[PDB]
Each structure stands twice: as structure tokens, then as C-alpha cells.
Amino acid sequence: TTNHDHHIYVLMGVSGSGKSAVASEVAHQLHAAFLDGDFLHPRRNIEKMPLNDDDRKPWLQALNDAAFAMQRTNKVSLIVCSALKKHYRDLLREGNPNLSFIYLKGDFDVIESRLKARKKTQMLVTQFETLQEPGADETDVLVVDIDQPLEGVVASTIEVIKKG
């Protein structure tokens, strides 16, 4: 069964919005479970690695199943998944009423500079075109401004998680 006393937060946003870094630190501070969704891409997906809907299908099912597994024994679970399209989000939501999204939101230049700093440019543009910012119909979406130092993003994400 779904445990309503427990909750899943899917950190979403385009590649470069710092999702893993944020999730890892938040998880550590809240003693929460943490899953970087990027690790569940199918064998085949890693072999290819602008992915398509059919590409993402099995991945999103895996992430839906993982969230279900995580909420059984964890009060708080964080899953990183860009979840750019509303449909991807609805897929994560299936049978998971106790799941919400924390949208790490930033402008193109902020994300572009983080990407340029890492250890692509066109994909980022493509990232933004694909992204459908959650609208008023999605009431389980909380937004955090990533145009701030890492510790601030972390603390904004924590506030968003604790406000309820």
C-alpha cells in the first residue's frame, strides 16, 4: 500500500539545474532516502546515451516503481528526474498520491554557465523547448529558484519539504 504518512519528492528541471547535487545534500541533512533517477535508465538507454517519449517510457515506469518501493520504509524520499513533460510527471504520479515535485527552476544563462563549468549547448536549448513548466493544474509542484549558491538552493528545498 501507499503510505500517506510518507512522501516522495521528485526533483525536476532541465539538465544543468543541479538536481543531483541538491538532492544528495538535502537527503543527507534530512536523513532521507535518495535515488538519482539517471541510474535507472535501461541498459539500452545507457547504450545510446534529444531522447524521445518511447525512450523515456520504461525509465519512468522504473522510477514510478522505485518511488513506490522507497515510500514503504522512508518518511522522506528524493528522486532526481528531469520530468520535463507533464505526461512524464503524470506517469510518476500513478499510484503515488504521496508524491510531489520540486522544480529546480532557472533561466537559460544560469543553467548554461553551470553546464559550461562541468568536468552540449544545443541540448540545453532543446531541454528548454521540451520543458513544460508545471501550471496551476499541477498542485503538487513546488518551485525553488536555482539562481543562488548551492547552500541556498539546499535550504530552499528543505523549507519546501518541511512547510507541510
Next chain:
Amino acid sequence: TTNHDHHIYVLMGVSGSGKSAVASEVAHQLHAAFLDGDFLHPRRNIEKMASGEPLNDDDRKPWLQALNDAAFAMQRTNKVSLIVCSALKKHYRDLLREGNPNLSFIYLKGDFDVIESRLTQMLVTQFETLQEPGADETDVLVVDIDQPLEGVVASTIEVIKKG
């Protein structure tokens, strides 16, 4: 491709050996990737634990394949990746190793006295299922869990840095 410069450590051992607590802390201190493999279990597998039934080999199969896949995904962009998996049988370990030469195991080892205190019946069954890695398993590093968490964490870090 496999990046032999990168490494995956599967923290193994029976339930109650503190696998998750150690992995979490280690990953954070090292900035390593971390996946608790329990989260990749198929619902049916979850359910057998619901009623308190000990798991089967065919049970564990897709679970292990997905852990194998996750290890391969983790090693592409992380120099150090930690996966929690009890990996009690030698065959489970072999499944995780397939295609992953850069995967080894960190065995959180303790006997029944300790794990019972650190912790009923499943524990007894865990030990029966446990096939302690022998000499034919060279990518197994052993960590004594009969010390505080801080020490376990430190011994685990040392094991990862020795190589």
C-alpha cells in the same frame, strides 16, 4: 563503455549489518554516487517480505540484473559509486560482476552475536543463506562491523582508498 578508472563498491552483508547507514555516510564524505539496491526490488519481491517469507533465487534474479544495470550506469560518470546489496550468495555476486570488472564488494562482516545486538528469526536465515566470500573471490574487501558506525565508515573509506 566501462571506465576502469572508475569503481563500484557493493556494500554486502546480512540485514542488520548497517549497509545503508554506512553507504550513505561514506558516499557523502567522498562525494560518491550512492544507490540503495533495496529500492530496485520488484513489487512481488516487496510483497514476499510483507508476509515474512525468505526470498528465492528466481525471486532475486531481475533484482540483480537491475542492480547490474545500475552499476554500469553509475560508473559512466562517477569515479566512486556505492551500491547497497546484501549479495549473500556467490552466484548473486557473480551476476553483479558481469560486465563490471570495476565492481568489487565491501563485506560488512560480523557474527550472530553482534548483529543480533546491533539489531529474530530472519537473522538466522540470513546467516544460512550467506555464503561468505572465499579465496576464489578476489575483489572482496572485508570490513569488521564490531566497532562504532564512525569506525565502520572510516574502515570503509580506507578500503576504497587503498584502491
